[PDB]
Amino acid sequence: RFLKVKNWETDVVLTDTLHLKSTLETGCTEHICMGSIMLPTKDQLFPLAKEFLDQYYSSIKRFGSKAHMDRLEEVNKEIESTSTYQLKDTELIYGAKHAWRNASRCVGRIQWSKLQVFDARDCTTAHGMFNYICNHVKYATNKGNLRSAITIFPQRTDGKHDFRVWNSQLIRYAGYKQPDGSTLGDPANVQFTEICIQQGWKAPRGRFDVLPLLLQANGNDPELFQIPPELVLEVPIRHPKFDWFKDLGLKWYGLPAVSNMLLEIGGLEFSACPFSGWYMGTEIGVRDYCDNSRYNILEEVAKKMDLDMRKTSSLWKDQALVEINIAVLYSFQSDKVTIVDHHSATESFIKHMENEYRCRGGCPADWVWIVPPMSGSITPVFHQEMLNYRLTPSFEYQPDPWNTHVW
Amino acid sequence: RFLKVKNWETDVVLTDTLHLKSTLETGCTEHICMGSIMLPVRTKDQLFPLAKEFLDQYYSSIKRFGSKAHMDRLEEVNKEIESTSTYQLKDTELIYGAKHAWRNASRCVGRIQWSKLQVFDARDCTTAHGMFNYICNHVKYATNKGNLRSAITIFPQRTDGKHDFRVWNSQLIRYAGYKQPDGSTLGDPANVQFTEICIQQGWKAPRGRFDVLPLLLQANGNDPELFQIPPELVLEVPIRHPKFDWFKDLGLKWYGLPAVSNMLLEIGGLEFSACPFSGWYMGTEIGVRDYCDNSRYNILEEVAKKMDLDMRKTSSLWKDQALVEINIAVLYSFQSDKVTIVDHHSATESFIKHMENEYRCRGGCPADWVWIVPPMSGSITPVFHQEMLNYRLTPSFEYQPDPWNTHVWKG
Ligand code: HEM
Ligand code: HEM
Numbered sequence: 051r052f053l054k055v056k057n058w059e060t061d062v063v064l065t066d067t068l069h070l071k072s073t074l075e076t077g078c079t080e081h082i083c084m085g086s087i088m089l090p091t092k093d094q095l096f097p098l099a100k101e102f103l104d105q106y107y108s109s110i111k112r113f114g115s116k117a118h119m120d121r122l123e124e125v126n127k128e129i130e131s132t133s134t135y136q137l138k139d140t141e142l143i144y145g146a147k148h149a150w151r152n153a154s155r156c157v158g159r160i161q162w163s164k165l166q167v168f169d170a171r172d173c174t175t176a177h178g179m180f181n182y183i184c185n186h187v188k189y190a191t192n193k194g195n196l197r198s199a200i201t202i203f204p205q206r207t208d209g210k211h212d213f214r215v216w217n218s219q220l221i222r223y224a225g226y227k228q229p230d231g232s233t234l235g236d237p238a239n240v241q242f243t244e245i246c247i248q249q250g251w252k253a254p255r256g257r258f259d260v261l262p263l264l265l266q267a268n269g270n271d272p273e274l275f276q277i278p279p280e281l282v283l284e285v286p287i288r289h290p291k292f293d294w295f296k297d298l299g300l301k302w303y304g305l306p307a308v309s310n311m312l313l314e315i316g317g318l319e320f321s322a323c324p325f326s327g328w329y330m331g332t333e334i335g336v337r338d339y340c341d342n343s344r345y346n347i348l349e350e351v352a353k354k355m356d357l358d359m360r361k362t363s364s365l366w367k368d369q370a371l372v373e374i375n376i377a378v379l380y381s382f383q384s385d386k387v388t389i390v391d392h393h394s395a396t397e398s399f400i401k402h403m404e405n406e407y408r409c410r411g412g413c414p415a416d417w418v419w420i421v422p423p424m425s426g427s428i429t430p431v432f433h434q435e436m437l438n439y440r441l442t443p444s445f446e447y448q449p450d451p452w453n454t455h456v457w
Numbered sequence: 458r459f460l461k462v463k464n465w466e467t468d469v470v471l472t473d474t475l476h477l478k479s480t481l482e483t484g485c486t487e488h489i490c491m492g493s494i495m496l497p498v499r500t501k502d503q504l505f506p507l508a509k510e511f512l513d514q515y516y517s518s519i520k521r522f523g524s525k526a527h528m529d530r531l532e533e534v535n536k537e538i539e540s541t542s543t544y545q546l547k548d549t550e551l552i553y554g555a556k557h558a559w560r561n562a563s564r565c566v567g568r569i570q571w572s573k574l575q576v577f578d579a580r581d582c583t584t585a586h587g588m589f590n591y592i593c594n595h596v597k598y599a600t601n602k603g604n605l606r607s608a609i610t611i612f613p614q615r616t617d618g619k620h621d622f623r624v625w626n627s628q629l630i631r632y633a634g635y636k637q638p639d640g641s642t643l644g645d646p647a648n649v650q651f652t653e654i655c656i657q658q659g660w661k662a663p664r665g666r667f668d669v670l671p672l673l674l675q676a677n678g679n680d681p682e683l684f685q686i687p688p689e690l691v692l693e694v695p696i697r698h699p700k701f702d703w704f705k706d707l708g709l710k711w712y713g714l715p716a717v718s719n720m721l722l723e724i725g726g727l728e729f730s731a732c733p734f735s736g737w738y739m740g741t742e743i744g745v746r747d748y749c750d751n752s753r754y755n756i757l758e759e760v761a762k763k764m765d766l767d768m769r770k771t772s773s774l775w776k777d778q779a780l781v782e783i784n785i786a787v788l789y790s791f792q793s794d795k796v797t798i799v800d801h802h803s804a805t806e807s808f809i810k811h812m813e814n815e816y817r818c819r820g821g822c823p824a825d826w827v828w829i830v831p832p833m834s835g836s837i838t839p840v841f842h843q844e845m846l847n848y849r850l851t852p853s854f855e856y857q858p859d860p861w862n863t864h865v866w867k868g
């Protein structure tokens with residue numbers, strides 16, 4: 051019940067006690083492990099509020115103080131009365147930072163305490179949402195010197211007045227299926243791209259078209275907005291050795307900004323809470339470019355490299371993959387846009403884990419997501435045993451809005 | 458109940474009902490997943506239900522469930538247990554058991570081959586010398602001059618846990634490791650403890666970087682004895698690179714036959730503590746793990762040095778570049794010497810086909826994603842995108858503690 055995790059490359063052993071504070075469920079049982087599955091009233095609200103307020107006042111070393119009890123009392127009163135409650139700015143910031151801290155699938159959490167939190171709870175319209183999001187993007191991008199940030203729109207009330215960003219990321223490329231039969235641009239975004247067009251958007255029908263924002267305030271119909279191009283920092287992808295690489299015509303955007311998740315703090319639900327950091331190179335070079343269900347350029351690159359693509363055992367896919375990921379890192383670094391390679395990022399996470407085990411008693415971590423999609427075992431996280439469990443505050447998935455929206 | 462797994466690249470969805478037949482635990486709870494943890498004595502009491510369940514499965518597979526042969530066998534095993542406190546498997550049952558232990562091995566990506574396993578019955582063995590002979594025959598059979606053949610040799614089952622047969626080696630063929638006074642290691646660092654034991658038992662070590670370890674064999678609970686595998690039985694492959702001529706001068710080689718010899722085979726409640734099995738290598742086992750783990754031969758530096766890569770910052774991906782070249786060399790060398798090997802793209806593609814087939818005919822396929830996904834180029838293999846369910850079926854292979862930690866020495 052007091053658990054140990056071992057690193058098999060270093061023999062370092064850490065003792066986990068934090069998991070005992072876990073609340074939600076993992077999807078696993080004693081009979082079956084679901085570790086590789088992608089997606090497994092007034093009464094309930096006050097205990098949730100109490101659990102959060104307790105950990106908050108503990109963190110500021112005022113557990114059991116007058117101010118603690120008073121606040122517990124005040125929130126209790128507000129829930130009995132209004133059937134909900136509002137977070138103090140200090141509580142909102144703490145809650146958001148700890149949602150990141152608790153994100154077991156995130157390798158970048160060593161940065162968790164340096165999150166810029168933008169309070170957008172006074173927002174009432176989609177035009178206001180757009181304004182807040184432009185300011186976010188500009189602050190976060192910072193001329194290529196990226197800074198982590200989250201913008202938090204008003205919390206769910208009766209589930210009919212939800213704030214939602216319909217895009218999965220603030221910045222993403224459009225996808226269109228060709229009459230020919232293939233897919234132009236990003237296949238991942240074919241459905242969403244349709245809903246943009248099938249709602250007003252005029253598509254350039256290109257390969258790297260930055261999608262418009264589809265913003266929904268207070269449960270209303272969502273509205274289209276184009277992010278000012280001058281706020282969208284993109285990087286042309288070239289290679290430090292292969293001069294034909296530039297001719298592939300590839301580029302990617304600098305800002306990874308997830309906008310479709312749900313932030314839970316003290317029982318309150320923030321259905322619109324776009325957050326952003328900076329990329330690990332493999333997210334673009336391995337997944338975005340080389341997934342078969344994405345831009346899928348491996349064969350094209352291997353061809354230009356003149357590799358022997360007759361047999362899989364020549365490892366031509368593997369060679370091309372490395373070169374593509376060299377290009378991505380080289381390109382961002384050259385344009386002075388923040389990026390981290392998978393070696394640096396995983397070494398950072400090992401350091402973070404040790405910090406958390408020492409100062410917090412543990413660090414929930416999902417091995418399946420933490421290990422990079424290339425060169426797994428030559429990164430230290432591959433050899434690191436990890437315990438996965440769910441702490442709150444937390445980021446959670448939520449249904450795509452078009453399936454839920456009472457139109 | 459139904460359970461569905463989705464492949465996120467193909468959108469293919471499979472339905473698992475087989476997990477309902479699961480008995481053993483996973484280590485996970487509703488509150489914590491232990492999926493990345495490496496490693497998460499038996500009386501007459503619990504034995505007959507274990508026996509019965511296995512025999513039910515056996516007779517079902519041969520389309521004889523409930524037959525007179527089935528009921529008689531149950532009867533016979535029952536009376537054998539209550540009078541002798543154990544029982545003996547028929548040859549047919551043993552073969553079925555061994556094949557299904559492999560079939561049920563959720564961490565094994567090579568299971569498309571499970572039904573083609575050569576089972577060698579060594580249950581009549583009584584001495585370490587007898588063990589050595591059986592093991593030599595296994596190695597010769599399995600190696601087949603490079604045309605590798607899967608096989609398992611099964612020594613007598615545990616009785617009171619005080620007369621165990623054990624192969625003290627983790628694998629039948631492995632290179633020695635030597636700790637030097639300056640803190641460095643000569644050979645395979647993984648095998649330093651075992652090497653020191655062999656030396657203590659009287660092995661005259663050559664003290665080179667690739668010395669094949671002697672077999673250390675325990676029969677019937679007796680102290681183990683040293684044996685040298687005839688070198689002519691140990692097939693090795695010099696490693697060279699198809700473009701880089703300097704690669705051969707690194708002086709690398711590896712053995713052709715992967716043969717695990719320290720696991721326990723459970724069949725119908727019976728425990729076979731010595732059951733060496735072998736197949737053929739996936740290239741990455743050697744090229745990624747054996748050669749490039751920091752705690753193993755660790756040749757990334759040397760290789761990258763000779764490739765003249767930018768080694769100052771990690772973001773040059775010099776480690777990733779060297780890793781691919783090493784794995785190309787391993788595959789090239791094995792194929793050139795006509796020794797059976799499979800690359801991780803072929804192996805994972807075959808596993809997906811296997812898994813889909815198993816869902817269709819068996820109702821499921823227990824699989825451990827953490828182990829099934831290869832240690833390089835993960836997401837460009839099809840298993841990366843494949844949801845998997847991990848659960849435990851029997852018959853099974855299990856870990857057991859190393860014998861030198863539990864053995865009562867006779868002298
Ligand atoms: C600052 C640098 C950051 C880096 C390098 C980073 C890296 C990553 C990576 C590689 C993943 C894997 C997800 C995938 O493969 O699609 C991930 C997941 C995740 N990240 Fe981070 N991230 C960063 C910042 C942040 C921030 C600022 C937040 C929130 C405030 C965050 C929250 C999350 C969450 C909630 C997930 C998992 C989502 C899920 O469950 O699917 N990350 N991160
Ligand atoms: C014939 C070709 C085979 C291939 C390519 C293959 C491949 C693999 C690989 C790559 C692993 C991961 C282990 C590691 O990374 O160290 C593995 C695990 C395993 N294999 Fe196979 N294998 C083969 C044959 C067999 C046979 C013949 C048996 C048994 C009769 C077997 C039983 C197992 C078991 C039980 C594990 C899991 C070990 C554990 O739980 O830690 N395999 N295999």
Ligand SMILES: Cc1cc(N)nc(CCc2cc(F)cc(CC[C@@H]3CCCN3C)c2)c1
Nearest residue numbers: 158306307308311325326327328329330333
């Ligand atoms: C802030 C941030 C930094 C970074 N460096 N990277 C990302 C993107 C990674 C990511 C984070 C999430 F919080 C949620 C998701 C969605 C999961 C995706 C959707 C489809 C495939 N995958 C399941 C991705 C975000």
Ligand SMILES: Cc1cc(N)nc(CCc2cc(F)cc(CC[C@@H]3CCCN3C)c2)c1
Nearest residue numbers: 567715716717720734735736737738739742
């Ligand atoms: C038949 C076979 C084929 C193949 N292609 N390959 C192997 C070796 C893979 C393997 C299988 C096992 F049943 C147990 C182990 C030991 C795991 C090691 C020991 C220490 C670190 N690691 C946990 C390896 C065996």
Ligand SMILES: C[C@H](O)[C@H](O)[C@H]1CNc2nc(N)[nH]c(=O)c2N1
Nearest residue numbers: 432433434435493494495827828
């Ligand atoms: C901590 C983690 O479970 C451990 O390093 C595992 C990860 N996956 C693996 N997968 C395979 N095939 N072989 C291994 O030795 C390991 N090691």
Ligand SMILES: C[C@H](O)[C@H](O)[C@H]1CNc2nc(N)[nH]c(=O)c2N1
Nearest residue numbers: 086087088418419841842843844
């Ligand atoms: C089926 C499997 O869970 C799925 O492919 C996961 C595996 N691990 C991952 N890991 C990360 N970081 N991102 C992903 O999208 C995935 N996909």
Ligand SMILES: [Zn+2]
Nearest residue numbers: 078083485490
């Ligand atoms: Zn689990």
